[PDB]
Design an enzyme around this catalytic site. Structure first.
Site, PDB file in Angstrom:
ATOM      1  N   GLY A   1       0.788  -1.235   0.000  1.00 39.33           N
ATOM      2  CA  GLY A   1       0.000   0.000   0.000  1.00 39.33           C
ATOM      3  C   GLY A   1       0.815   1.278   0.000  1.00 39.33           C
ATOM      4  N   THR A   2       0.119   2.409  -0.118  1.00 41.27           N
ATOM      5  CA  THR A   2       0.766   3.728  -0.201  1.00 41.27           C
ATOM      6  C   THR A   2       1.390   4.125   1.138  1.00 41.27           C
ATOM      7  OG1 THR A   2      -1.223   5.053   0.333  1.00 41.27           O
ATOM      8  CG2 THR A   2      -0.856   4.515  -2.002  1.00 41.27           C
ATOM      9  N   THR A   3       2.288   5.102   1.101  1.00 42.74           N
ATOM     10  CA  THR A   3       3.008   5.531   2.298  1.00 42.74           C
ATOM     11  C   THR A   3       2.103   6.400   3.178  1.00 42.74           C
ATOM     12  OG1 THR A   3       5.035   5.607   0.938  1.00 42.74           O
ATOM     13  CG2 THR A   3       5.183   6.489   3.181  1.00 42.74           C
TER      14      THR A   3
ATOM     15  N   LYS B   1      -8.635  10.152   2.907  1.00 44.00           N
ATOM     16  CA  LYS B   1      -8.171   8.877   3.484  1.00 44.00           C
ATOM     17  C   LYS B   1      -7.957   8.911   5.002  1.00 44.00           C
ATOM     18  CE  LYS B   1      -5.387   6.182   1.104  1.00 44.00           C
ATOM     19  NZ  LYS B   1      -4.190   5.700   0.356  1.00 44.00           N
TER      20      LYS B   1
ATOM     21  N   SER C   1      -2.218   2.264   5.948  1.00 43.04           N
ATOM     22  CA  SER C   1      -1.684   1.806   4.669  1.00 43.04           C
ATOM     23  C   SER C   1      -2.055   0.348   4.482  1.00 43.04           C
ATOM     24  CB  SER C   1      -0.166   1.943   4.646  1.00 43.04           C
ATOM     25  OG  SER C   1       0.224   3.297   4.771  1.00 43.04           O
TER      26      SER C   1
END
Ligand SMILES: [Cl-]
Ligand SMILES: [Mg+2]
Lengths: 231, 244, 195, 111, 250, 235, 241, 243, 240
Positions: free
Chosen positions: H29-31, H61, H74
């Site tokens: 997943g994204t940071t 988010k 994340s």
């Protein structure tokens, strides 16, 4: 391979294969397009038939006077989820005398789809949805995926060959966003967008399905001779 | 989930057999032999204890023969623990019938209900069946003296003479040879012991390796008596027939 | 519902039951049969709260008929009465009890003896030579104490019963529109058409 | 002891013509000898050319109207936007009211 | 969520064996030796206190347990399984008997109730059998003194004397030679200590041996006086000192 | 083994796809919709000559304005029909009107996916639901165990379905009379049936606005069979 | 071989899931120790904070269960906290139902019975932890009772747990052979903590700073943990002797 | 083997492979990061702009719990949402019974026990998210990071996702260079920089920055989003540092 | 509760558990049903490997559901008791609410519905039993004979057989039974039923059971000697 027996199992690379297989059912489904301006939001859906003797599968479902969606994948799963949306929209009206925000509508669908991906016995939903609506913060377009992921967009498309329409909308972004106070021209842009996903077949009178919602326009669906204007 | 570890106890084989029932019967075929013989004036129940140890308390013991009510008794073959579950159910069912109708339960009704319980474990619930075969010996005023058997399948049948457990094939042939319809209790007692004496896996049949019981009308005038034999009474009956 | 009588004689049991069905100030029916055949040699008469009576009688009838099919055997009158008593004994501590009183007349084929059981709505069972429920008993019991003999015939039992009905017709406040009489013996159940 | 019912007064009136129909009602709302509102409408447009009023205990009346309006909405969803006929609406309302037979809506209803 | 294991984990194999019961018996075989001997005027039950560490206080871990004032129990196999069985066995003696009849159950019936619990673990959903064999010694007015063995299957047998666990085969042979029907209680305690020395390897004293008796009534252990009919518990656990006294004249 | 509600890698439910194979083994059922009515016809397919063919009930009434034909594991259809009949009558009780054919079909299709680990498996039977209402007129629906339903002008299901569907493609037009449609069902049934078609091994039915849902007699069907044979020989 | 996945017997009478839960105990690579004084019970444990971004005050494997009972865990923190929360609830409920503070040994038994259930029931896994309970009991005095995934429990004169447990155990065994007694003959708890740390230093062979240790002390009517500065004061006392 | 096919099964090592497999989904997943400061906490996240068609600023988010706690995660976004929904229920019942708003350590254990519960049975799947969260309570500022196993600790700085190692390295420098403490307004600017630096590990698609914060002085102890002038100021600071 | 879906579809579109239940029926002793002009006759095989039996008390193969309807079966004996019990209860329940005994079609439809429910219910296996249900509707003289099977399908038959070697006896009945002219009398119907069983049975001693059902609750079971007379008569005519 060994990690796709059920939704409760992770793969060694951290994947949920049953969720991915549910995602695959959407790609097999017929194409549908969503796009919006600041005043209106439009759904355009290519309906599919079993043969010439059959009817064309209805893709667009109304949820409230100000909200509705189009489907792509398992139609019964869309019926379950749309029914849940109808109830949640209705709960908001009866209890709070408040039209349900399109953003909250997405959040609720996300949470409903998620529970099915973490428990033994059940299965993920096998359908993707494009929700449009007009609420207190203007026009909205959402993209639901049965993984749980919901995304707010200016325009998008899902189903088979949806990449053609999605590229067109990515180019046309600056044009169609400013079609304010003009329903017919926003639909025309949506009909031209879905045309980029057509192969061999063309848009006929009982094939095309259009829906619109806006500032002074309730969520209404157009089928049959009513869509002959846009061919 | 848990599906992975489910044995699926209540399914059919491709041949149309119930795996677990068949395997439960295979279990029972290693248990101590139990014989039932029905005479015109009574019923005999005989049963061989499973390889006795010399330090086992024999007089205050109950392994094979159990009393359901005053008119009905059972001989067990298989898992004792399983049998005791079913026996306490049968004992209760008999008292429910008496409480309801103010009449002692007919033998077949008690047998059917106990057999219906076993049937349930083969069709639903996902549990293992009871690894038990019964010989029911009882009396009522409708059919008189009756012998039945039930097995893990929940199927029951009536008999004039019958064996369950080990060496039933050999035992049933010997009973089929010497049994006749005008037989008395004392003759049936002798037959039961002679049959066990030949079919036994032991070297010699002795009092300490046996359980014995009779159901006679040998009480005073038109009433049934259950006699669960004491160790010394088995010793005497074994000498009297000339086995020891 | 009101009048139900029972007389056990030498070789039979005779049950008499009133024909009137009244609600309010109107006699709705004058030919009502307040009984059900539980088995070929067992008859049950009933009286009590409206609706409850028939619902209970038919419920018992269904259960006894079910037993008969299952075992291919008729239950003894003693056994049927004990079953009925237990049902009423459960009922009395229910949310809404059956308010029904019954008489069970039967012929035991094994003993070759007639049997009469009186059971009230509480589940109070008694075997009797003669029985009655409701206000009827206040006249008939003393009458039968005097005139009843244990060795009487069926014909003598019917004359003894006529003597009860005449007394009730004379001294009871309500018109109960006569009675339906039924006899239970070794040959089964039959109805006396002219009473 | 707590009394769940009240009387909010008022009166309503329905008359039918050859090609039209009227449903009238006064706008007064009361409790005992006090006036609550001089203008509180109790005759409502329920959709599909059906007008409705439930007069008596206003809380129960508002609840019933609210439920019937909602019944009309779900009739459209479940039966392809079909128009709810006046005779069908009446039968639907019977089931709404009788559903609370043992704890009634204290209202006299007219559509 | 929820217990989805509603099916039997013990089933019949093609040969007719109940695998999990056999395997539970194998676990009992690995367990430390325990024994029981019945005398004319009493019963003795004994076992070795296998200490997990010398820093551990072996007094706190009780292998021999009181179930009722006249009934005691000892085991071989898995200790935790034994501990919960003793808890359930004590409770069932009250719920299914004492709260009904106003008196403690006789040995055979309590044994029967324990056997029922162990049988259910053999057939119920989502559970394994108990990995223990129990020896239950007790006394009651109408049956007198008695000794019972209870296996993982739920089967139970009465014994004059027996042993279970590690060196049970040799111990049973030893008991057959020494046992007679005229044994006094003290003689049975003496034989129990002799039998147990064979199976024990390390230290053999009152601190490594656990031993209890079912004998005469103990008014001093009752805790009160004034009721003539209440004469005290027949179950007594022998002290560390009391064992060592009998080890000198061994 | 594996879960009942499991997806395949292609994005389909295994059990649903397997139930569709069971339906292909079933006896043929054909439906044709016209402006004068909707006709339903089925192959009875008696397993033995001793079996009394009139007891084979593969065409069924749901309400006066809705009929139903089946194909596949026909035992599974009993609870579906029971539900349909209750749904139709219940709607009439709540709304004092006939229920829309589409709404009835949708109610039946809601049972379809109510299976898992609710019932243990999908239905092994497909249904042709034919009817009439005031709004959308004469209608024919095909209800599967997937929970999906399609409206059709004409439709064949069962063992001879793909062959019969291709034949219906050519023969159907929007101006078909009821009599023409009756013969067309008989014609196509006779083509795909194993045994020779007669009044005892095939059954006809129709639904009209005026007379409602009617299963034809063996005497009436026999005349339509005789009329069909003569017309084919006439050119 | 599904007999290794759930808690059922293997052919040789073993529960492999229980045995593998024991191996999860040492996953943290921490060693704990417990000893009894005259008036007190001291427990010590290693504290390892590898990440620089961690808030070291929140890194702890010692828990205050009740006012009188303290608990140290050897095993992963999620299972440790699971056990801690349950023990806290059990101790609180005991006081409410029976009108007195739950004893250390009784809580140990209760947690052990819970651990036993997981070895017998299939749907529940065992917790991969070893729970060491310490208190000064009002009846039994200074107490150490230890629970494991098998459901086993016992009292201790002293004890140790962790990867290098055996080295610490024998170090303590040799001391009690010499002293000829069941405890640390010492008046103040401060010197009992000093004893505990000293013998851990000797057994493990490592030196400790203030942030390398974590100390819990049980006295009559209260159990408490020591701060970094309380330990530092204690380390200085050892060094100057 | 087969020890990795079912959740809650110990391998011979003493490991639950299913939980370790969930960690792989988190790493994918994204940071996202968290920075503890003088009198509060700061949260930031990387939002990948998949397409021009994504509406800017309208796919939020970071989530709020109660009024004083912020949560970011994340991995599987829906799993994170499910966890926050539980967090909100836990915080609501705490306030209902005990009146005071839930303390951060108290809240941390409520999530920790819930996530740990999803490693106890084979009928449930572990959470596919590492959750960074925290806020301000009576005892001051607290930052926490919770993992699929149920493991959580307090943190001076926290990071998770595809660019976690880059972010961790950058976080470690801030802890060393600012021992006395970092201010709230500084931490917002640093948070922006660290996301931009951590974006180097996900540089195919360009991204959208999103920051939130709790601070006793700046936000009055409540959770707020950083928007408008303060957001653009933090973006410009981050843009200047990469060049 | 035990939930497992035991009866499920396979790739080829078959429910193996239902098909394996049919194999259990094929293993069971033969049963035959033949309906005449004014009667129905149910014939049943009894295997002769069992001597020393007590035929007084042994469960009879033909069971009365009500006074006017009977049920024979082939397959698992224990399973059949459960269906018979349910059917008997429903028969009395129908009399109680409709004030009229069940029709043979209704009783069959109920039993068949129970069998079907066990093919798509969780935690249960199908009944390893097929039934022949025969009788006469109330106030009706038309004979009724129905068959059910594990799947749940049911149908009416002029004559039918089930169980082991049923395909042999079905072959016999298919040529020997005339639709245009069924057995006019009781004797003719019983004889045809005994003849059909004699193709399969072995000996006509204590191996054949016969039960005759006539209108208005007139049911009677034939004894050994009565059946043996048909066996003796058929064999003498055969030698030709
Ligand atoms: Cl406990
Ligand atoms: Mg009375």
């Amino acid at each position: 391979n060994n990690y796709d027996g059920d939704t409760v199992t992770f793969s060694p690379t951290g994947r949920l294969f049953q969720v991915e297989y549910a995602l695959e059912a959407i790609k097999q489904g017929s194409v549908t397009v969503g796009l919006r301006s600041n005043t209106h939001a439009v759904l355009v859906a290519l309906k599919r038939n079993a043969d010439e003797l059959s009817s064309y599968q209805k893709k667009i479902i109304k949820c409230d006077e100000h909200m509705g969606l189009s489907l792509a994948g398992l139609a019964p799963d869309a019926r379950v989820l749309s029914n849940y949306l109808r109830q949640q929209c209705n709960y908001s009206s009866l209890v709070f005398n408040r039209k349900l925000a399109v953003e909250r509508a997405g959040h609720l669908l996300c949470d409903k789809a998620q529970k099915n991906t973490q428990s033994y016995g059940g299965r993920p939903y096998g359908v993707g949805l494009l929700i449009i609506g007009y609420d207190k913060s203007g026009a909205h377009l959402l993209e639901f995926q049965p993984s749980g992921n919901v995304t707010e967009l200016y325009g998008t498309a899902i189903g088979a060959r949806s990449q053609g329409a999605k590229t067109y909308l990515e180019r046309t972004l600056d044009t169609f966003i400013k079609i304010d106070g003009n329903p017919d021209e926003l639909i025309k842009a949506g009909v031209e967008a879905i045309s980029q996903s057509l192969r061999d077949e063309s848009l006929t009178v009982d094939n095309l399905s259009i829906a619109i919602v806006g500032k002074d326009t309730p969520f209404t669906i157009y089928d049959g001779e009513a869509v002959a204007k846009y061919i | 989930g848990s599906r992975r570890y489910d044995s699926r106890t209540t399914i059919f084989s491709p041949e149309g057999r119930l795996y677990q029932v068949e395997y439960a019967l295979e279990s029972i075929s290693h248990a101590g032999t139990a014989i039932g013989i029905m005479a015109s004036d009574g019923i005999v129940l005989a049963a061989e204890r499973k390889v006795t140890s010399t330090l086992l308390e024999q007089d205050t013991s109950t392994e094979k023969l159990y009393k359901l009510n005053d008119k009905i008794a059972v001989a067990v073959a298989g898992l004792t623990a399983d049998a005791e579950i079913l026996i306490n159910t049968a004992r209760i069912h008999a008292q429910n019938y008496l409480k309801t109708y103010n009449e002692d339960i007919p033998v077949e009704i008690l047998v059917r209900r106990l057999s219906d319980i076993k049937q349930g474990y083969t069709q639903h619930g996902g549990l293992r069946p009871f690894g038990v075969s019964f010989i029911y010996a009882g009396y009522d005023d409708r059919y008189g003296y009756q012998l039945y058997t039930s097995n893990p399948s929940g199927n029951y049948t009536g008999w004039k003479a019958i064996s369950v457990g080990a060496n039933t094939s050999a035992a049933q042939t010997l009973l089929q040879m010497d049994y006749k319809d005008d037989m008395k209790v004392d003759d049936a007692i002798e037959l039961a012991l002679k049959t066990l004496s030949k079919t036994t896996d032991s070297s010699a049949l002795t009092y300490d390796r046996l359980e014995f019981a009779t159901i006679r009308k040998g009480a005073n005038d038109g009433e049934v008596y259950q006699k669960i034999f004491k160790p010394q009474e088995i010793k005497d009956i074994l000498v009297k027939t000339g086995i020891t | 519902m009101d009048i139900i009588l029972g007389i056990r004689v030498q070789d039979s049991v005779i049950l008499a039951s009133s024909k009137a069905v009244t609600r309010g100030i109107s006699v709705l029916k004058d030919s009502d049969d307040k009984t059900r055949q539980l088995s070929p040699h067992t008859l049950m008469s009933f009286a009590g709260e409206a609706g409850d009576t028939v619902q209970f009688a038919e419920y018992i009838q269904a259960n006894i008929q079910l037993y008969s099919i299952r075992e291919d055997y008729e239950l003894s009158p003693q056994a049927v009465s004990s079953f009925v008593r237990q049902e009423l004994a459960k009922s009395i501590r229910s949310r809404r009890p059956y308010q029904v009183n019954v008489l069970i007349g039967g012929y035991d084929k094994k003993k070759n003896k007639p049997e009469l059981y009186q059971i009230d709505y509480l589940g109070t069972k008694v075997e009797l030579p003669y029985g009655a429920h409701g206000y009827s008993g206040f006249y008939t019991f003393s009458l039968l104490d005097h005139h009843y003999r244990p060795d009487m015939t069926t014909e003598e039992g019917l004359d003894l019963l006529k003597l009860c009905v005449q007394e009730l017709e004379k001294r009871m406040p309500m018109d109960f529109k006569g009675v339906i009489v039924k006899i239970v013996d070794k040959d089964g159940i039959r109805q006396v058409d002219d009473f | 002891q707590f009394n769940p019912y009240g009387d909010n007064g008022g009166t309503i009136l329905g008359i039918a013509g050859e090609d039209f129909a009227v449903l009238a009602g006064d706008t007064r709302n009361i409790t005992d000898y006090s006036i609550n509102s001089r203008y509180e409408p109790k005759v409502f447009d329920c959709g599909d050319n059906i007008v409705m009023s439930a007069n008596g205990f206003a809380a129960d009346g508002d609840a019933l109207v609210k439920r019937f309006k909602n019944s009309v909405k779900w009739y459209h969803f479940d039966h392809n936007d079909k128009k709810l006929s006046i005779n069908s609406a009446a039968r639907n309302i019977q089931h709404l009211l009788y559903g609370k037979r043992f704890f009634p809506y204290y209202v006299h209803t007219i559509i | 969520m929820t217990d989805r294991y509603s099916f039997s984990l013990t089933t019949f194999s093609p040969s007719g064996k109940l695998g999990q019961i056999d395997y539970a018996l194998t676990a009992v075989k690995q367990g430390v030796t325990s024994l029981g001997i019945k005398a004319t005027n009493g019963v003795v039950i004994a076992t070795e206190k296998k200490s997990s560490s010398p820093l551990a206080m072996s007094e706190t871990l009780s292998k021999v347990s009181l179930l009722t004032p006249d009934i005691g129990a000892v085991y071989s196999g898995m200790g935790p399984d034994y501990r919960v069985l003793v808890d359930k066995s004590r409770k069932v003696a009250h719920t299914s008997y004492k709260r009904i009849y106003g008196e403690y159950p006789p040995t055979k019936l309590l044994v029967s109730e324990v056997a029922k619990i162990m049988q259910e673990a053999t057939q119920s959903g989502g559970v394994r059998p108990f990995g223990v064999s129990l020896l239950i010694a007790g006394h009651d007015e109408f049956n007198g003194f008695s000794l019972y063995q209870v296996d993982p299957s739920g089967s139970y047998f009465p014994w004059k004397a027996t042993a279970i666990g590690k060196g049970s085969v040799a111990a049973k042979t030893f008991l057959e030679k020494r046992w007679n029907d005229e044994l006094e209680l003290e003689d049975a305690i003496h034989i129990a200590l002799l039998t147990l020395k064979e199976s024990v390897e390390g230290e053999f004293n009152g601190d490594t041996i656990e031993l209890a008796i079912i004998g005469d009534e103990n008014p001093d252990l009752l805790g009160y006086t004034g009721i003539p009919t209440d004469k005290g518990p027949r179950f007594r656990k022998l002290t560390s000192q009391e064992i060592n006294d009998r080890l000198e004249a061994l | 083994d594996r879960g009942v509600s499991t997806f395949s890698p292609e994005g389909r439910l295994f059990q649903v796809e397997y139930s569709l194979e069971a339906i292909k083994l079933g006896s043929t059922a054909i439906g044709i919709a016209t402006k004068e009515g909707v006709v339903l016809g089925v192959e009875k397919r008696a397993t033995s000559p001793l079996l009394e063919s009139d007891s084979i009930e593969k065409i069924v009434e749901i309400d006066r304005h809705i009929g139903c034909a089946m194909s596949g594991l026909t035992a599974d259809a009993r609870s579906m029909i029971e539900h349909a009949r209750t749904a139709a009558v219940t709607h009439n009780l709540y709304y004092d009107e006939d229920i829309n054919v589409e709404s009835l079909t949708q109610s039946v299709c809601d049972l379809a996916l109510r299976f898992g680990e609710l019932m243990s498996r999908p239905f092994g039977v497909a249904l042709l639901i034919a009817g009439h209402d005031a709004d959308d007129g004469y209608q024919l629906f095909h209800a599967e165990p997937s929970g999906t339903f399609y409206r059709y002008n004409a439709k064949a299901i069962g063992s001879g379905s793909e062959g019969a569907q291709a034949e219906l493609l050519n023969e159907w037009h929007s101006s078909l009379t009821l009599k023409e449609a009756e013969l067309l069902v008989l014609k196509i049934l006779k083509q795909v049936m194993e045994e020779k078609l007669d009044e005892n091994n095939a059954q006809l039915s129709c639904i009209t606005k005026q007379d409602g849902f009617k299963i034809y007699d063996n005497e009436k069907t026999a005349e339509l069979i005789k009329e069909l044979k003569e017309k084919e020989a006439a050119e | 071989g599904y007999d290794r996945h759930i808690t059922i017997f293997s052919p040789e009478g073993r529960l492999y899931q229980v045995e593998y839960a024991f191996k999860a105990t040492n996953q943290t690579n921490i060693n704990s120790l417990a000893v009894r004084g005259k008036d007190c019970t001291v427990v010590i444990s290693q504290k390892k904070v590898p990440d620089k971004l961690l808030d070291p005050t929140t890194v702890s494997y010692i828990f205050c269960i009740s006012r009188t009972i303290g608990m140290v865990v050897n095993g992963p923190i999620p299972d440790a906290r699971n056990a801690a929360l349950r023990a806290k609830a059990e101790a609180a409920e005991f006081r409410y139902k029976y009108g007195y503070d739950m004893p250390c040994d009784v809580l140990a038994k209760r947690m052990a019975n819970l651990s036993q259930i997981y070895t017998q029931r299939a749907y529940m896994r065992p917790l991969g932890v070893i729970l060491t309970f310490v208190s000064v009991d009002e009846e039994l005095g200074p107490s150490i009772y230890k629970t494991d995934p098998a459901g086993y429990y016992v009292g201790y004169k002293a004890t140790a747990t962790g990867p290098k447990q055996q080295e610490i155990t024998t170090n303590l065994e040799n001391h009690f052979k010499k002293s000829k007694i069941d405890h640390i003959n010492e008046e103040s708890w401060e010197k009992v903590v000093e004893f505990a740390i000293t013998h851990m230093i000797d057994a493990l062979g490592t030196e400790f700073s203030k942030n390398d240790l974590e100390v819990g002390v049980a006295t009559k009517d209260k159990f408490f943990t020591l701060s970094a500065e309380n330990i530092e004061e204690r380390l200085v006392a050892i060094a100057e002797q | 083997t087969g020890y990795d096919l079912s959740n809650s099964v110990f391998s011979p090592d003493g490991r639950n492979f299913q939980v370790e497999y969930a960690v792989k989904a988190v790493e994918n997943g994204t940071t996202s990061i968290g920075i503890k400061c003088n009198d509060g906490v700061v949260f930031a996240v990387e939002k990948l702009i998949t397409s021009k068609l994504l509406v800017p600023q309208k796919n939020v988010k970071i989530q709020v719990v109660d009024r004083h706690i912020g949560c970011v995660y994340s991995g599987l976004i829906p799993d994170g949402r499910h966890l926050v929904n539980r967090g909100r229920e836990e915080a609501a019942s705490f306030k209902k019974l005990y009146k005071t708003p839930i303390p951060i350590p108290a809240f941390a254990d409520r999530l920790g026990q819930y996530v740990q519960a999803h490693t106890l049975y084979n009928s449930v799947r572990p959470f596919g998210v590492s959750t960074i969260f925290g806020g301000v309570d009576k005892n001051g500022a607290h930052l926490y990071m919770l993992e699929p196993s149920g493991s959580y600790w307090g943190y001076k700085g926290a990071a998770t996702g595809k660019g976690r190692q880059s972010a961790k390295a950058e976080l470690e420098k801030l802890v060393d260079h600012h021992p006395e403490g970092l201010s709230a307004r500084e931490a917002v600017k640093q948070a922006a920089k660290i996301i931009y630096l951590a974006h180097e590990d996900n540089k195919e698609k360009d991204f959208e920055l999103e920051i939130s914060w709790c601070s006793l002085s700046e936000t009055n102890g409540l959770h707020k989003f950083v928007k408008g002038d303060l957001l653009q100021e933090a973006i410009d600071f981050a843009q200047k540092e990469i060049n | 509760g035990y939930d497992r879906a035991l009866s499920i579809f396979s790739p080829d579109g078959h429910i193996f558990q239902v098909e394996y239940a049919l194999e259990a029926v094929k293993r069971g002793t033969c049963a035959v049903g033949v309906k005449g002009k004014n009667c129905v006759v149910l014939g049943c095989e009894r295997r002769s490997t069992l001597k020393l039996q007590d035929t007084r008390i042994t469960p009879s193969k033909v069971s009365k559901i009500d006074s006017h309807v009977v049920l024979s079966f082939s397959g698992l004996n224990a399973d059949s008791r459960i269906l018979i019990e349910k059917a008997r209860v429903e028969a009395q329940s129908h009399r109680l609410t409709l004030e009229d005994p069940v029709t043979v079609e209704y009783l069959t439809r109920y039993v068949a519905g129970v069998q079907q429910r066990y093919t798509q219910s969780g935690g249960v296996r199908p009944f390893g039993v097929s039934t022949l249900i025969a009788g006469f509707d109330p106030r009706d003289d038309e004979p009724k004979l129905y068959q059910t099977e594990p799947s749940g399908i049911y149908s009416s038959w002029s004559a039918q057989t089930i169980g082991r070697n049923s395909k042999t006896v079905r072959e016999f009945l298919e040529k020997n039974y005339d639709r245009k002219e069924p057995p006019a009398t009781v004797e003719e119907c019983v004889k045809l039923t005994v003849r059909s069983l004699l193709e399969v049975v072995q000996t006509g001693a204590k191996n054949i059971e016969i039960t005759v059902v006539k209108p208005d609750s007139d049911i009677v079971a034939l004894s050994s000697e009565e059946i043996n007379q048909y066996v003796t008569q058929i064999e003498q005519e055969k030698q030709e």
